């Protein structure tokens, strides 16, 4: 679950620039739109029928911020991913019954949203480092499962 010393430096330096509100809200919104079955877990939020309603939903934006803040804990604790997500692993696996594959799907959507926000600066080398972080976060969340 780790990267080169120069990888962490690059990963964290980019995070200094991430707006958790804008990125978080877009990531959760694109998850619900691209993989519709995930809407099933957020019916309490309201109308999620079309992308217009989803991206403009305040609940989606607010929750997306919370999710992104969690990835932030991950990024700042890469050596202790399992411990950082123990509580959330219990919630998502034992309480919500969310299939693990979905942890991996949200991870990639997030990377796609980072690519859209930083453009040519999100180099293939930078993405490669983030594919490790996202993989690690997903694995740690699936721990309490197995």
């Amino acid at each position: 679950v780790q990267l080169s010393g120069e990888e962490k430096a690059a990963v964290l330096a980019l995070w200094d620039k991430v707006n958790e509100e804008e990125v978080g809200g877009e990531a959760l919104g694109r998850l619900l739109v691209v993989y519709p079955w995930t809407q099933r877990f957020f019916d309490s939020f309201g109308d999620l029928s079309n992308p217009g309603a989803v991206m403009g939903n305040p609940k989606v934006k607010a929750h997306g911020k919370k999710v992104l803040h969690s990835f932030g804990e991950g990024v700042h604790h890469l050596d202790n991913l399992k411990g950082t997500f123990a509580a959330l692993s219990e919630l998502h696996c034992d309480k919500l019954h969310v299939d693990p594959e979905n942890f991996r799907l949200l991870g990639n959507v997030l990377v796609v949203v980072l690519a859209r926000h930083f453009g040519k600066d999100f180099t293939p080398e930078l993405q490669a480092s983030y594919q490790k972080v996202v993989a690690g976060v997903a694995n740690a969340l699936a721990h309490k499962y197995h």
Binding site: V33, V34, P51, A115, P124
Partner: protein, 141 residues
């Protein structure tokens, strides 16, 4: 799998890609080789070095193949039949790798066309790539 709205979104999305399909295909491959080294196993006979001309040429092939598929959405199995034979029976590519390349293609599109890569476009393009992937991994001789 593909609704009318999806076909519309795809055709329109590929129209913005225009003549850059090959460039994007090349970049997506570069992103895939670095992000998931496992994929390099399939290209032993390749120079996967930074800026390699082989990857560039292959990117063009992949890009044209995709433009071809967008023109035959209502019959991907037939338009991509030779490609399926190559990837499924001859190469025996693990279907998992197709998800990797598709994700790297969407990432590349997000980078170059940030204003056009909308949630709806993203969703249709994803179903599109999934459809093409299923055809290239199925042995339906």
């Amino acid at each position: 799998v593909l609704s009318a709205a999806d076909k519309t979104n795809v055709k329109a999305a590929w129209s913005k890609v225009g003549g850059h399909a090959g460039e994007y295909g090349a970049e997506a491959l570069e992103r895939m080789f670095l992000g998931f080294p496992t994929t390099k196993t399939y290209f032993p006979h390749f120079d996967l070095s930074h800026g390699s001309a082989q990857v560039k040429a292959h990117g063009k092939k992949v890009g044209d193949a995709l433009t071809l598929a967008v023109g035959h959405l209502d019959d991907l199995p037939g338009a991509l039949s030779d490609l399926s034979n190559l990837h499924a029976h001859k190469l025996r590519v693990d279907p998992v790798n197709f998800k990797l390349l598709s994700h790297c293609l969407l990432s590349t599109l997000a980078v170059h066309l940030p204003n056009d890569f909308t949630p709806a476009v993203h969703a249709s393009l994803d179903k599109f790539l999934s459809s093409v992937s299923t055809v290239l991994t199925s042995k339906y001789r």
